[PDB]
Design a protein around this nucleic acid. Structure first.
Ligand SMILES: NCCC[C@H](N)CC(=O)NCCC[C@H](N)CC(=O)NCCC[C@H](N)CC(=O)N[C@@H]1[C@H](O)[C@@H](OC(N)=O)[C@@H](CO)O[C@H]1NC1=N[C@@H]2C(=O)NC[C@@H](O)[C@H]2N1
Length: 271
RNA sequence: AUAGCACUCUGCAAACACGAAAGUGGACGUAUAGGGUGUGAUGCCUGCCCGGUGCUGGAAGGUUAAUUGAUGGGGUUAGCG
């Protein structure tokens, strides 16, 4: 869906339209306040540039652990979440408890989900990797027993279960990495919803300002005191590209962790 | 500056930033995400060069630090003259 060019700022706007989303307010008992930061830490200094402004948002409490084992639940509705790119699903359990989960692709109001060792193989069901079938497509992959889902949670994301060896399952991630995960950790059947999210076109600078991104100033445009790229009469680069703090930006690798190297079977390649 | 484009880094106790540390931002986010760099709607497009500098990946040959202390050369004196 592309907007008509009735004004110059509308010529290149492309939105994604899902008519099945809930139109009303979110579920109040599962919503809490959240303040803006401006990219500043407790010293008051800017630690992440280009952050500030944007629309006011509430936080939605999403159940990532899925520890309500054995109790079936029905989907009430699919909701828009301002905190993430994925849609969320409101669940009503057989005992009347309500929770939010990351909505898998295809899930609608009326579908049935559950979690545990003996949960049936359906999208949105949460099971241990030791019980997942080989070759299946999963999302919301847990890394520490009991911590909850951490991997493959963004819109349209999924991982592939390749095999099980010892106490570890082998998974392929969207980045191309092949990784080991302890078989006691849980995952969710299916892929994340809103997979058309990357087809949107903002169309104007105000659309990014609404999302809270402040403008980026190139190092080429500064003075020598501000940036290694600054200075010169006219336009000239004359230097291998670096960050404002002097770290090379073209191909130089920055990973330093040595504690978790054993879990990486095969790197995505040019890391 | 900008929407759009591209390269590259980052598997989460993420990279990156602040700080002496504790800790904090990134983010109560998880590669359709986050940082850095360049270009600047859109249309048609974007040729040749890896010798130099850099980056990435190999090789185990040559060179090299602390550490180690085999040998050789002196000082001194019991004794012998
Ligand atoms: C990528 N960034 C999207 C983009 O910019 N699309 C533009 C945009 O919708 C609009 O362009 C203006 N309005 O300036 C339109 C003119 O109606 O043309 C499109 N571009 C096009 N290129 C295509 C072409 O040559 N043939 C076939 C058709 O696909 C053409 N449309």
């Amino acid at each position: 869906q592309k907007c008509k060019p009735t004004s110059p700022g509308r010529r290149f706007v492309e939105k994604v339209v899902h008519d099945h989303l809930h139109k009303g307010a979110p579920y109040a008992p599962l919503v809490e306040a959240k303040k803006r930061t401006g990219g500043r830490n407790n010293n008051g200094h800017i630690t992440t540039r280009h952050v500030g402004g944007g629309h006011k948002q509430h936080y939605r409490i999403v159940d990532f652990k899925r520890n309500k084992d054995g109790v079936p639940a029905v989907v009430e509705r699919i909701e828009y979440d301002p905190n993430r790119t994925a849609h969320i699903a409101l669940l009503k359990y057989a005992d009347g408890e309500r929770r939010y989960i990351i909505a898998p692709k295809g899930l609608r109001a009326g579908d049935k989900v559950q979690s545990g060792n003996d949960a049936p193989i359906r999208p949105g069901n949460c099971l241990p990797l030791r019980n997942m079938p080989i070759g299946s497509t999963l999302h919301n992959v847990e890394l520490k027993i009991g911590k909850g889902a951490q991997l493959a949670r963004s819109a349209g994301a999924s991982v592939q279960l390749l095999g099980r060896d010892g106490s570890y399952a082998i998974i392929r991630l969207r980045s191309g990495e092949m990784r080991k995960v302890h078989v006691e950790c849980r995952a969710v059947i299916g892929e994340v919803s809103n997979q058309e999210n990357n087809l949107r076109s903002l169309g104007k600078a105000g659309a990014a300002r609404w999302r809270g991104v402040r403008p980026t100033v190139r190092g080429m445009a500064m003075n020598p005191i501000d940036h290694p790229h600054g200075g010169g009469e006219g336009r000239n680069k004359g230097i291998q590209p670096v960050s404002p703090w002097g770290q090379k930006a073209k191909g130089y690798k920055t990973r330093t962790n040595k504690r978790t190297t054993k879990m990486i079977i095969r790197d995505r390649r040019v890391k």
